[PDB]
Amino acid sequence: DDRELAILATAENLLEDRPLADISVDDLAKGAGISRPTFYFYFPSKEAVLLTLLDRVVNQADMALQTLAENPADTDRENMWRTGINVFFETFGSHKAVTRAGQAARATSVEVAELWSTFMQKWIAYTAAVIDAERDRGAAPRTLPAHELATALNLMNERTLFASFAGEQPSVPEARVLDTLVHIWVTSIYGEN
Amino acid sequence: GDDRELAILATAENLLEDRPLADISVDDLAKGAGISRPTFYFYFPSKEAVLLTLLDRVVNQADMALQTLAENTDRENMWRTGINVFFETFGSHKAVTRAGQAARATSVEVAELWSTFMQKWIAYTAAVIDAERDRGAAPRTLPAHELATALNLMNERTLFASFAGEQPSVPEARVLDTLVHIWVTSIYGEN
Ligand SMILES: CC(=O)NC[C@H]1CN(c2ccc(N3CCSCC3)c(F)c2)C(=O)O1
């Protein structure tokens, strides 16, 4: 239980400058102070260590958003979307290596692909519901179907925050991505040509 | 573009419609093109190199199409015809598009190829935004390059999700209207 934390902390540290494939099971066992076979009391494989790390990061975001879902709407409509987008920016930005490794594994692991697909569907669904609620109150024009607008905005964030977190080029500079995304959500959700 | 080289590339693109590159053998490619296996290795060293040539061909088709409309309306239409170049070019080659995106995690050439063209299309977008600012048609909100980067990355992710049939995704029939709406509102809107 205490050695299990050691294995996860070692994996997250090692993933910062090495992909999971360049990480052996012996690597994690040494990092945790245990023999290699003793690892398998805690985890069936290194893939399961990544899955546990990703599940905790994803659920950290999920609980931070749901905390905002249960509490009154902010007088300031720009700031309500900024606070939601910032959960993603801060949660995943605090676990870049796991975020990166998680994205790579979406191609190879049905568990990872399902975790990420399901999380994105959940928060796209929530975004569509807030937009539709904004229309019902007259705060937002009835332009595009809410769920399609919400999907594209959420897909932009996934791609743009990942590009920023991985240091890719092209990419928005890290200190600027929050303002950039918020501007595009707010104008596309509240404007009409 | 040798006559047998085109048969290899056409066979590859056909087979990629329903099978990933990993389920396609060199023997699959040779037989489809009506050639021997050594003939195959006369033109390509690997099936990955076939994919790279295929993707290089569609990427550059989109680019050329984009430059000729740059070489030449209504505001919404400008951005729509521009976005449509990518929706139509990559939409006419969904198999190569799907395989191209998968190979970006394994092939540095594929990665660098895509990255180089995205930077070019992003810089182009920023300059057009800048010129709509210069003539007073667009407000000076975010820096043009940052706005251009998030919008182009949106299109990349959203266009791939449709062509790859993912969930979540925007239905193919609605992706152009969706993206056009977000561009024109975010480029021309303030507050
Ligand atoms: C499938 C894929 O990945 N596409 C990549 C990007 C490129 N791009 C893009 C670039 C330049 C413009 N121009 C066209 C003339 S007018 C001013 C804007 C444009 F509309 C769109 C996208 O939206 O997707």
CATH number for A31: 1.10.10.60
Alpha helix positions (H), chain B: 3-15, 26-33, 37-43, 47-70, 75-91, 94-103, 108-134, 144-163, 172-188
Tokens of B110: 């594929």
Same domain, residue pair B4 and B93: no
Same domain, residue pair A57 and A147: yes
Q: Report the residue of chain A nearest B148, measured CA to CA.
A: A172
Whether the upstream peptide bond of residue A72 has omega within 30° of 0, thus cis, is no
Tokens of A87: 């959960």
The overall longest dimension of chain A from CA atoms, in Å, is 64
Whether the upstream peptide bond of residue A170 has omega within 30° of 0, thus cis, is yes
Resolution of the structure, angstroms: 2.3
Contacts of A180 in chain B (CB under 8 A): 142, 146-147, 149-150
Rounded to the nearest 10 degrees, what angle do helices B75-91 and B47-70 cross at? Answer: 160
Q: Do A180 and B150 touch (CB under 8 A)?
A: yes
Ligand 1 contact, B158 CB (< 6 A): no
Same domain, residue pair B32 and B21: yes
Q: What is the DSSP letter of B18?
A: T
Q: Do B184 and A193 touch (CB under 8 A)?
A: yes
Same domain, residue pair A52 and A97: yes
Which contacts qualify for B36-45: CB closer than 8 Å, 24 or more apart?
Answer: B39/B4, B40/B8, B43/B2, B43/B4, B43/B5, B43/B8, B44/B8
Class of residue A112 by CB neighbours under 10 A (exposed 0-12, middle 13-18, buried 19+): buried
**CA–CA separation, B126 vs A185, rounded Å?**
19
Tokens of B109: 């050439």
CA-nearest of B169, B123, B150 to A164 is B150
**CA–CA separation, A34 vs A32, rounded Å?**
6
Which CATH number belongs to the domain containing residue B173 in this structure? 1.10.357.10
Task: Report the residue from A104, A143, A169 with minimal CB separation from B181.
Answer: A143
Technique of determination:
X-ray
Same domain, residue pair B12 and B52: no
Task: Report the residue from B147, B168, B181 with minimal CB separation from A151.
Answer: B168
> Residue A9: which domain range?
1-45
Number of domains chain B contains: 2
- Position of tokens 């190979």? B103
Q: How many CB atoms lie within 10 A of CB B21?
A: 17
Same domain, residue pair A159 and A171: yes
Contacts of B156 in chain A (CB under 8 A): 159
Task: Report the residue from B157, B177, B189 with minimal CB separation from A191.
Answer: B189
Ligand 1 contact, B79 CB (< 6 A): yes
- Position of tokens 């300031």? A76
**CA–CA separation, B14 vs A125, rounded Å?**
36
Tokens of A182: 């918020």
The answer to whether A112 and A102 are in contact (CB under 8 A) is yes
Residue A87's φ and ψ, nearest 5 degrees, are -55, -50
List of residues 6+ apart from A12 with CB closer than 8 A: A53, A95, A97, A98
- Position of tokens 């390059």? B145
| Residue B90 CA, closest ligand 1 atom number | 1
| Residue B82 CA, closest ligand 1 atom number | 14
Same domain, residue pair B53 and B39: no
List of residues 6+ apart from A82 with CB closer than 8 A: A178, A182
Task: Report the gap between the CA of B177 and the closest CA in chain A (Å).
Answer: 8
Q: Render the burial of A133-142: b for 16+ CB within 10 Å, e for the rest.
A: ebeeeeebee
**CA–CA separation, A34 vs A39, rounded Å?**
7
Same domain, residue pair B9 and B71: no
CA A91 from centre of chain: 7
Tokens of A132: 């539709």
The answer to whether B20 and B105 are in contact (CB under 8 A) is no
Q: Do A163 and B153 touch (CB under 8 A)?
A: yes
List of residues 6+ apart from B7 with CB closer than 8 A: B32, B33, B34, B35
List of residues 6+ apart from A172 with CB closer than 8 A: A160, A163, A164, A180, B146, B149, B150
**Going by CA atoms, what residue is nearest to atom 1 of ligand 1?**
B156
Rounded to the nearest 10 degrees, what angle do helices A174-190 and A77-93 cross at? Answer: 140
**CA–CA separation, A64 vs A61, rounded Å?**
5
Same domain, residue pair B36 and B75: no
**CA–CA separation, A180 vs B148, rounded Å?**
10
Q: Which amino acid is at B139?
A: P
Q: How many CB atoms lie within 10 A of CB B132?
A: 18
The answer to whether B182 and B154 are in contact (CB under 8 A) is yes
The answer to whether A105 and A20 are in contact (CB under 8 A) is yes
Same domain, residue pair A30 and A63: no
Same domain, residue pair A22 and A59: no
List of residues 6+ apart from A103 with CB closer than 8 A: A162
List, as one string, the DSSP characters of A17-55.
TS-GGG--HHHHHHHTTS-TGGGGGT-SSHHHHHHHHHH
**CA–CA separation, A7 vs B100, rounded Å?**
35
Q: How many CB atoms lie within 10 A of CB A72?
A: 5
Same domain, residue pair B74 and B132: yes
